[PDB]
Amino acid sequence: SFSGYLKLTDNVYIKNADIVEEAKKVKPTVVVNAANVYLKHGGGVAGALNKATNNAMQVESDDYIATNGPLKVGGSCVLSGHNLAKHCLHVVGPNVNKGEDIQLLKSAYENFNQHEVLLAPLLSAGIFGADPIHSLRVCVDTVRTNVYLAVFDKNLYDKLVSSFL
Ligand SMILES: O=C(NCc1nc2ccccc2[nH]1)c1ccco1
């Protein structure tokens, strides 16, 4: 079960943790992946989660894309969580480095509401280029289900907690 999280709101919790190690320890029902529309898990959270599955996440994802085509920015799909979780919810937040619309971040977080409890990263943060403080704000104002946020970077985690309104 989830331990060492700081409570931000009634339903949002946060911890300075590597989401891969957190997923291997907790084996949650749902781990969220910071996916792209192609489910190409090359880097960031996606690359790390996929590497932890020995590439099984990428093999499953390529079969999913071959059958269904790409996801929408702001959309999601549920796939296996492999050795990390029961399920992986691949959520596509806007990548502002690729010029995608930041307003799609609320739509991306709305996917979390279909699951009672999730282990998740901050969407569009990291290599996706959005301001993580803004992502946490959108998360708390959009997600109503229980979300356990893992923030890899200690300095960012401290900035997120200390600046949380
Ligand atoms: O590959 C690993 N960590 C690197 C990593 N961890 C991230 C978390 C968020 C964003 C980028 C990251 N990149 C690993 C394997 C097992 C435990 O950790």
Swiss-Prot record:
Location(s) in or outside the cell: Host endoplasmic reticulum membrane
Assembly mode: May form homohexamers. Interacts with N protein.
Signal peptide bounds: none
Mutagenesis / variant outcome for changing T29A: In strain: Mu/B.1.621
Activity regulation statement: Inhibited in vitro by GRL-0617.
Protein source organism: Severe acute respiratory syndrome coronavirus 2 (2019-nCoV)
Record domain Macro: where: 1-165
Summary of the function given for this chain in its UniProt record: Responsible for the cleavages located at the N-terminus of the replicase polyprotein. Participates together with nsp4 in the assembly of virally-induced cytoplasmic double-membrane vesicles necessary for viral replication. Antagonizes innate immune induction of type I interferon by blocking the phosphorylation, dimerization and subsequent nuclear translocation of host IRF3. Also prevents host NF-kappa-B signaling. In addition, PL-PRO possesses a deubiquitinating/deISGylating activity and processes both 'Lys-48'- and 'Lys-63'-linked polyubiquitin chains from cellular substrates.
Protein name: Papain-like protease nsp3
UniProt topology in membrane: Multi-pass membrane protein
Entire protein: shown range: 1027 to 1191 of 7096
Lineage of producing organism: Viruses, Riboviria, Orthornavirae, Pisuviricota, Pisoniviricetes
Gene name tied to this protein: rep
Catalysed transformations (reactions): Thiol-dependent hydrolysis of ester, thioester, amide, peptide and isopeptide bonds formed by the C-terminal Gly of ubiquitin (a 76-residue protein attached to proteins as an intracellular targeting signal)
